[PDB]
């Protein structure tokens, strides 16, 4: 599975400091309180940090991303 049976992503409560923050300039990182929470495919180039409990990682996002989770910026098991 995980095909494009779900085409778009219209999620209302994961949104109200994201879609409104287009007119506002990009000076602060958008902090996230999940390992799941995603955002639009038309906003491409924001910053989301991997949320688990101790420290944050470098997150670099370019224009060409379509596929899957945020689990690559910090790893699943990051080789302690």
């Amino acid at each position: 599975p995980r095909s494009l049976k779900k085409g778009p992503f219209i999620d209302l409560h994961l949104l109200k400091k994201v879609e409104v923050a287009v007119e506002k300039n990009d000076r602060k990182p958008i902090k996230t309180w999940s390992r799941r929470s995603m955002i639009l495919p038309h906003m491409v180039g924001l910053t989301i940090a991997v949320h688990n409990g101790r420290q944050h990682v470098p997150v670099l996002v370019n224009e060409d991303m379509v596929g899957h989770k945020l689990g690559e910026f910090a790893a699943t098991r990051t080789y302690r």
Binding site: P58, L60, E72, F73, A75
Partner: protein, 109 residues
């Protein structure tokens, strides 16, 4: 040139195409309605019925052209700090297989 690479004889014609990787059930209608007989070899018949069985080489991907983008997309995964290159920097299975140790044919040396 004839099937890309030089081809050993004394074997089958449809399996001369169905040469490791994309084929037979899609070429199920190709070798049956072109008129090109599966019942004999690529040489011993008329040498003319290969001309459209040779044009399929340079239309989508080639033995030389598969080497073209064999390093572009892998370069997209190594220095971008990601996890498809975290088990490529290590050499493990990447797509979530039998995970850590004692795996048969996925790690190698």
């Amino acid at each position: 040139r004839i099937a890309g690479v030089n081809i050993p004889d004394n074997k089958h014609t449809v399996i001369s195409l169905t040469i490791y990787g994309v084929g037979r059930t899609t070429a199920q209608s190709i070798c049956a309605a072109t008129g090109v007989n599966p019942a004999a070899k690529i040489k011993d018949l008329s040498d003319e019925q290969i001309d459209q069985l040779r044009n399929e080489v340079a239309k989508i991907t080639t033995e030389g052209d598969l080497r073209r983008e064999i390093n572009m997309n892998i370069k997209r995964l190594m220095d971008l700090g990601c996890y498809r290159g975290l088990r490529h920097r290590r050499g493990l299975p990447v797509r979530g297989q039998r995970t850590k140790t004692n795996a048969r044919t996925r790690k190698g040396p």
